[PDB]
Symmetry: C5
Subunit: 205 residues, 5 copies
């Protein structure tokens, strides 16, 4: 405990806080989804409700330490309030995201961070035809709200959404689920913004 | 990071906070809407629910810096809590506005600020006739709750609401959408208050 | 800005906070309502939902300044958290009040304050007969929860509720709307408590 | 104001906070209910919703003062955050309690405190038969969640719930309403826990 | 009170906060459930709502004291904010958990802690067949969100859920209710995570 207390104190009390990524020092965030449930479909508003875990990974030089100086500690858990976290946002939500998991991340000695918030999201999707064999397809993009591709880039480790925790007695069965990097351009703004597009194809069970 | 950390520290730790606009030093806020979805209509309460992005722009001398003194930094992202933001409020809401995007703004070296909150709003609107060819028209005014025209003025860059991110499979298609500056007077209060009136004409798709 | 920054600092950093009104130094609060909408009626729970602005006015010696010492500033806007505000409470609500406007007040050099929160309120009201010509009458009292008449008194400027921003396409039209000072006595407590009784008579449009 | 400011400062800035009651220094809390409305009944979930005021009284030596030293002040109003309050909790709620009144208490020079929170509570109750002449009976216990009888005891001034503010046009009329001290024992825990059991018998009006 | 004030001050003001469990200093948390009500079932979303108390127990060397040095005090109640608490999380919730009891724990002189939060939980469960003699079975896992088995292990005192406070007039009667330790492995992560699996079998009464 003494060694971890020292490490956290050296990292968090001494530092002026990380001011986010910049054009000179950009950052790549890795995203992965594990889809747990399609809870609800609303055909009168074209809203669909998902429950998933969003795995986020990034790496900061300012979170590095030498494990030899801190009793061989290679990593630790810490409150997400102690650190910067990326502003990854759904581009087509219809409600504030509801947070289902404790806001705690894992920091590793090389400065890498893993953060896995569980969320419930309502987003724009037309479920008409969900009761057929073909099913429906729906999509929602996730990216930084405020940082362009020149400050935050995204990648995935796989294009396959993790379906191994999908609720087996859901009202909806999943036919496929992909997560794919894209580049968007907007009327408001000159620079490209990066997203990962979660595409889910499903039907009634 | 070092240069941005310095800049933020020089702007935000040293300063007593900006105390808002005054009659002697008034401010013009530019507003623009991009309408994403008419999610829901309630014909038993005459409430309609929109999802949009509200682009806000203003400029303060106290947020100026010389980029040459801070490693050629011309702009940065920062939490909206670090700065003053205008109290732009819908005049006919029926619920607290729900915030859908991170509360982060962009500050530029000339002291100009851009802030683009995504919101879901329930407001007063009679949807009777939405299922016809003619459709319905509805309106909501946005302005400072507490500052008159002598402290906060508003303008738009265009009278055309941006419909280029409008959800193509919404239950409602948009026939027109305008945003127009107006001047209001109230029994309580001697001075004029400025608003931008969002007028949306729509029908079932 | 320099002069207002000084004024706010002199008023709020130097002061120990106002400890509320007392028997020795009582306060009169002026209340006025402007009724915007009867949004909803629930005949299975006898709850009705209003949207209104509640104009509050009072005066404290501790908020006085000489405008000559602060660049001729006669008034300013400030966050309601910076100052004491009266605990005016609906006596027959069925839900927490929802706040629809920014919590910002106007302080004037003589120590007078104006604060105008927009609220949505669910309160106890039997709507049976609302669909008739006679309509229904409902009532809700507003007063200090904790201060008697010997510490907080109330008055109105008029007994007529302001109907000039009433939503013209509401489901309910207003037949009359009054706001009247009353004195209540309770088993628990020896002293009188003051309220303003909002009486609204309405029917389907 | 000067004298009250001094008193509050002497009581709250100088003190280390009261650490709650103990076996060596136990406390008796007096409870009384005034029932305002049975708002809603849900026969598909067996939940019933009440609105009431819960009068709480207790006394601490650490809140004593000599009125002669503070300009003859015998009592004052203060925010409930300034002081310890008992953790009185409904034992069979189905939702977090909703608070309907300002969190402000009255402290008197002998160290006694009065606190009267207005609440809306959903609790476990089977309303089947509410539409008959006999009506239904329902019950909910209120006590400390964490303190046994050896640290917190309870009493009532009367076994009769105060029905003098009961909403006359409620959907439900009250046949009887009692509040009675009881002693409970639990598998988890060796000591007795005290409650006041609110028993309400009611039917459709 | 003097003695307890000293103890709390010595434990909480002097200490740098416990930084959670580690591989070098792991922790075992004991969990037990007492099921109070199955409130609601939603067959269109496959969500079920429970109300229960979750008894949590663990032990830290840094919370030890010698009762002889503090007036023979063997234990005390304190706010949960004063101490570390395990991040025990439902793995298949569909909404944020609603907290129904005060966030206060009991600390004992040997460093052991007891914490018993009452919760309402919506979780993934197919109620189809609940209206039959056989009923339905549903399950939800509870464990650390972020700590593996090498930092947080779990155990139960019994595999039998405590049904002695189960609401006798619930819509649903309980046929069986068990709580059983398990070990999970996830695609994201190399180490095992421990849970207690709450299995409830029930039907309409
Ligand atoms: C219309 C664009 C979509 C969304 C908006 C928010 N936004 C942007 C740039 C800078 C700051 C900012 O808040 C753009 C990119 N964002 C992902 C716009
Ligand atoms: C009834 C008026 C509309 C709305 C209200 C709130 N308000 C005002 C002035 C100063 C402070 C203030 O809170 C007025 C202007 N506002 C836009 C009134
Ligand atoms: C039953 C009374 C109604 C309401 C309650 C709250 N209250 C009071 C006195 C002191 C403090 C206080 O909280 C009384 C006056 N208030 C307006 C009681
Ligand atoms: C199952 C029991 C009912 C409730 C629970 C919470 N509780 C207790 C003791 C100490 C701390 C504590 O949180 C007991 C008494 N409480 C009123 C248990
Ligand atoms: C998909 C896994 C389930 C859940 C998630 C959250 N989580 C984990 C490890 C480290 C940090 C973290 O936040 C894993 C274990 N947890 C119980 C994943
Ligand atoms: C800033 O601008 C000049 C001119 O382009 C450049 O050569 C210089 O190296 C820059 N300074 C820093 C610290 O990046
Ligand atoms: C306070 O005490 C008594 C109360 O009757 C009174 O005679 C005296 O005038 C009061 N004095 C002050 C300074 O308040
Ligand atoms: C504590 O216990 C001892 C006996 O074990 C006793 O002598 C002492 O008086 C006790 N503490 C008190 C009275 O505070």
């Amino acid at each position: 405990q003494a060694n971890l207390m020292r490490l956290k104190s050296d990292l968090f009390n001494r530092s002026p806080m990380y001011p986010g990524p910049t054009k000179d020092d950009p950052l790549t965030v890795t995203l992965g989804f594990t889809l747990q449930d399609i809870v609800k479909v609303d055909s009168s508003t074209n809203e669909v409700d998902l429950v998933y875990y969003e795995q986020q990974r990034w790496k900061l030089n300012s979170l590095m330490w030498d494990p030899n100086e801190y009793g061989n500690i290679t990593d630790f858990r810490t409150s997400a309030a102690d650190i910067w976290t990326p502003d990854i946002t759904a581009y087509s939500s219809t409600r504030p995201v509801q947070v289902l998991s404790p806001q705690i991340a894992v920091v590793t000695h090389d400065g890498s961070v893993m953060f896995i918030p569980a969320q419930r999201l309502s987003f724009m999707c037309d479920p008409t035809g969900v009761d057929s064999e073909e099913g429906v397809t729906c999509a929602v993009k996730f990216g930084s709200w405020v940082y362009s591709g020149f400050e935050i880039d995204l990648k995935t480790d796989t294009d396959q959404v993790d379906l191994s925790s999908y609720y087996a007695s859901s009202k909806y069965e999943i036919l496929s689920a992909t997560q794919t990097r894209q580049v968007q351009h907007y009327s408001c703004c000159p620079e490209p913004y990066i997203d990962v597009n979660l595409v889910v194809k499903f039907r009634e069970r």
